[PDB]
Structure 1
Amino acid sequence: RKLILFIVFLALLLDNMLLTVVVPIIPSYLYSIKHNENVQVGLLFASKATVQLITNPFIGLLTNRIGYPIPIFAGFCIMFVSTIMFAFSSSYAFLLIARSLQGIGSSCSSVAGMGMLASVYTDDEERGNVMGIALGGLAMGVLVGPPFGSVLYEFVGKTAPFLVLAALVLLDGAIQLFVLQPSRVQPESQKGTPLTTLLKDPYILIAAGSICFANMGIAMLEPALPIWMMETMCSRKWQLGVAFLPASISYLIGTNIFGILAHKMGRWLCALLGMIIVGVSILCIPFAKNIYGLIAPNFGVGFAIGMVDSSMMPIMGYLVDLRHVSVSGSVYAIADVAFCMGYAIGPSAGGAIAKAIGFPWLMTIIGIIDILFAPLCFFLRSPPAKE
């Protein structure tokens, strides 16, 4: 009963460590191998997000029809396959294929783990608060990602970070012996309202846009910042990956402090501050001309993204309880689609803008748009009811 929480937390951890061990390796590796590369790196990064966004409805169908453990085992297999593909392949196409597979793997793991965790814990009084461990699986994975993918990549080469990640994925899959079997036909029943009907509501879009933009900021920063750092003569030792470390250590505290303080000031008055602080603190990024000049803006970016996560995650459900037939899956689907839309559109537009007009202007434009988006949170003061 307890071990499912740890298993889903670890399966999110080993997915979102994989998601961010790529950012220091593949950009620099493709920069080196060719000695305008953004036109390819951006799409190589956006493939995972577009694949997960496409795949989510079908895995939802699979979970509704024939149960949760099957997609969990599928995701467990796909994560190891993608990791072993990263550890060995060199050509661009066979990195793109693995990043494509990682999208289906992330979809399976996230959706099925959320569903089965909700099923085991059932009622709100426990499950609703326990759900916040998803963010704790997010934060530590993102924290160990860049340092582990950079330091050992400097010390013992390309294959080491993915090799040691696979050494953990195999252990996690062996611990999953208790549930998953070669042959399992499993039951499930119908609940809730589908996303395609929920997003038809224009009011929920106002809340989804905040988290979408707050993640799109970092999703555009991710493909380009290593290239920008390489252009300004940065190294790998304590330099190439550690630049992302303050953002992670700040995210750890952002998901906790204002998560505790939410109700004390109004969650919309915290979402507004998170949005504005993201917009302001990504403007300071282009103007830093030294590695130690990037510590200050990242310590704000991570904190502000955590402040938006821990102040929008309950809200997407608080409204859905007031307007539509609600279930845990319908609550999580909004957040997952809002995450994936940003993580897909960000790199796709970045790989064009940063190459046609430049990276600092891309960050400035995103910051200004994020700042100007803030007044839209005025509407969440109180939503009116409906039939």
Structure 2
Amino acid sequence: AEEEKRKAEEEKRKLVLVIVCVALLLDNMLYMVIVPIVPDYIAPRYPTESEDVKIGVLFASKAILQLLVNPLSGPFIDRMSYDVPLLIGLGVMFASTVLFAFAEDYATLFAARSLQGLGSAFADTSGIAMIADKYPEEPERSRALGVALAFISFGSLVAPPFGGILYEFAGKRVPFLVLAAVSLFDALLLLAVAKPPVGTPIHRLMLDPYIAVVAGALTTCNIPLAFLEPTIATWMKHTMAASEWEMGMAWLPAFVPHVLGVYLTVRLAARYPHLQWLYGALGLAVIGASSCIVPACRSFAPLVVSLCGLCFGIALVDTALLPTLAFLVDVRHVSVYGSVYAIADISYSVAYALGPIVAGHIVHSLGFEQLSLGMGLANLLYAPVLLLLRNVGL
């Protein structure tokens, strides 16, 4: 009897995990392959440039619009379900992707990136929130958030070089239309599978110092990849004259230590459940080590190992603090997971919204090693700030 319904429920819950993680994979593929495509119109590819604030405000339009939406879309995920705002996010992401494949101007690209911001808020917060919801127990919550962040890192690291070599071979019409078709197939498959209490407000999560220090951790761990992603792809030619094939391929061996860091902290959170603050702090420590060591890496292979240490550190901090964030709102607040991952994406959003607007300007004014040592100083001075979470078992 009951074994059949239980294995069917675990089957459908694993299917929802796979469909949500593939949704996050394809969505981050969108956000990180439109970046080498945008400067080619407005007048072996590598994503970013460092010039033209008018284009940089387009690159940060996604992050500033999710920064403006998900404080209002946090309680939207709390009031309604998770599957309906995930469908709203994937629907506006389909509309965004066919708006990329539809036109080529500045205003339409700005509108498509803004719709990617709206879909980032809705779809990304709903996806991470229902991965936290459908895995209430802690060693499966950490492992499912690990698979989530592993496919997020897949779509954000190994997807931009192949998206670039599809833009150089096929173009922009056919790849974005078929990727929007695969995204609508994923959304309709989650409609076929999923079939879609009072909640705490978003103000009261900021008054919780534990949620506030995890939000500061996510801001300060995202801020090195925030300021270094529009910047390294012009520091290459200034430093060591990196080839264009070895240009956007620099984040491509940074996925393997990301998934090794994810696996390492899933192991060290299933073995040590109430010691995730130490792996968040150690993640921030190796973040500050990598950001301190990047301008010392004047050859290509040490730059690759420094950026893979950077993705290793963001993997440790994200996979050791996003289960801590849901566990923390579970044991200290009501057990609704939308607002607290809206706070997580607020941290993500303020990082990637201050990145492409003023990052290139403060590199052109101060320098590159000054910015890198500033962020490494921030992370070496913020890794002993995660010590406040030592009483999460108490």
Alignment TM class, shorter chain as reference: 0.7 to 0.9
Which residue of structure 2 lines up, in the alignment, with residue 280 of structure 1? Answer: 289
Q: Give the CA deviation at 1:214.
A: 0.7
User: Among residues 46, 66, 69, which one is paired with 1:55 in the alignment?
Assistant: 69
SS of aligned partner of 2:257: helix
Task: Give percent identity, aligned residues only.
Answer: 42
* Unmatched 5+ stretches in structure 1: none
Q: TM-score, normalised by structure 1?
A: 0.83
Residue 124 (str. 1) matches residue 141 (str. 2): no
Q: Give the CA deviation at 1:109.
A: 1.3
Which residue of structure 2 lines up, in the alignment, with residue 194 of structure 1? Answer: 201
Residue 327 (str. 1) matches residue 340 (str. 2): no
- Paired amino acid for 1:81: A
Instruction: Output one character per residue of 1:243-271: Cα deviation in whole Å (capped at 9) or x when no partner.
Output: 11122222111111122124549323322
Which residue of structure 2 lines up, in the alignment, with residue 372 of structure 1? Answer: 381
SS of aligned partner of 1:243: coil
Q: Give the CA deviation at 1:197.
A: 0.7
User: Among residues 194, 206, 221, which one is paired with 2:213 in the alignment?
Assistant: 206
Moved more, 146-155 or 58-67: 58-67
Which residue of structure 2 lines up, in the alignment, with residue 108 of structure 1? Answer: 122
Which residue of structure 2 lines up, in the alignment, with residue 258 of structure 1? Answer: 265
Q: Give the CA deviation at 1:300.
A: 0.7
Say whether the 8 Å CA contact 2:56–2:356 is kept in structure 1: yes
Q: RMSD over aligned Cα, in angstroms?
A: 3.2
Moved more, 296-305 or 51-60: 51-60
Q: Give the CA deviation at 1:155.
A: 3.4
Instruction: Assess, with a 3 A threshold, how the Cα gap between structure 1 residues 325 and 112 changes in structure 2: closer, same or farther.
Output: closer
Which residue of structure 1 lines up, in the alignment, with residue 230 of structure 2? Answer: 223
C-alpha distance in structure 2 between counterparts of 1:203 and 1:176, whole Å: 33
Which residue of structure 2 lines up, in the alignment, with residue 10 of structure 1? Answer: 22
SS of aligned partner of 1:192: coil
Moved more, 195-204 or 44-53: 195-204
- Paired amino acid for 2:311: G
Residue 147 (str. 1) matches residue 161 (str. 2): yes
- Paired amino acid for 1:58: L
Q: Give the CA deviation at 1:28.
A: 6.7
Moved more, 95-104 or 129-138: 129-138
C-alpha distance in structure 2 between counterparts of 1:117 and 1:207, whole Å: 19
Q: Give the CA deviation at 1:308.
A: 1.0
Q: Give the CA deviation at 1:200.
A: 1.4
C-alpha distance in structure 2 between counterparts of 1:77 and 1:200, whole Å: 33
Q: Give the CA deviation at 1:125.
A: 6.6
* Unmatched 5+ stretches in structure 2: 1-11
- Paired amino acid for 1:250: P
Say whether the 8 Å CA contact 1:52–1:106 is kept in structure 2: yes
Say whether the 8 Å CA contact 1:73–1:180 is kept in structure 2: no
- Paired amino acid for 1:244: W
Instruction: Assess, with a 3 A threshold, how the Cα gap between structure 1 residues 332 and 376 changes in structure 2: closer, same or farther.
Output: same
User: Among residues 365, 368, 373, which one is paired with 1:359 in the alignment?
Assistant: 368
Q: TM-score, normalised by structure 2?
A: 0.82
SS of aligned partner of 1:218: helix
C-alpha distance in structure 2 between counterparts of 1:329 and 1:118, whole Å: 9
Q: Give the CA deviation at 1:227.
A: 2.9
- Equivalent pairs counted in the alignment come to 373
Instruction: Assess, with a 3 A threshold, how the Cα gap between structure 1 residues 163 and 324 changes in structure 2: closer, same or farther.
Output: closer
Residue 298 (str. 1) matches residue 312 (str. 2): no
- Paired amino acid for 2:350: M
Residue 168 (str. 1) matches residue 182 (str. 2): yes
Instruction: Output one character per residue of 1:198-256: Cα deviation in whole Å (capped at 9) or x when no partner.
Output: 2112343222212211111111111222233355644443x232111122222111111
